[PDB]
Amino acid sequence: EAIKKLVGLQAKTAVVIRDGKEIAVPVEEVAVGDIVIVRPGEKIPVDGVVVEGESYVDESMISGEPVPVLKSKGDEVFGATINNTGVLKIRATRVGGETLLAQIVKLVEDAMG
Incomplete structure (x- = not known):
């Protein structure tokens, strides 16, 4: 439920493109500036900006909107959201x-702490 569910929704792994090749890494190893590749059906691991591809993304787990949102080059995407329809390459803008x-x-946590 809620916040506890959200923490559970965070990605644990990512696929980055480094030195011209795909590498699967724990999500903690993703840096701002990294190019991440996300396949249809996969969780977007970090916040970033689409650099290649076009796909409908399911953001219901954060925004509560049931209808997925079209993401194309230059659009912002968020960690924990689910990529639905097409392969995306995303430049990481915020991590951790x-x-x-x-x-x-x-x-x-701060408010209730």
């Missing part, structure tokens, strides 16, 4: 405690 999800968690 800086993601939207992490900021929500922090807001609640």
Whole structure:
């Protein structure tokens, strides 16, 4: 439920493109600037901006909106959201405690702490 469910929704792994090749890494190893590749059906692991591809993304777990949202080059995407329809390449813009999800968690933890 709620916040506890959100923490459980965070990605644990990512696939980054480094030195011209895909590498699967624990999500903690993703850096701002990394190019991440996300396949249809996979969780977007960090916040970022689409650099390649076009796909409907399911953001219901954060925004509560049941209808997925079209993401194309230049659009922002959020960690923990689910990529639905097409492969996306995304440049990471916020990772770790800086993601939207992490900021929500922090807001609640701080207020209730």
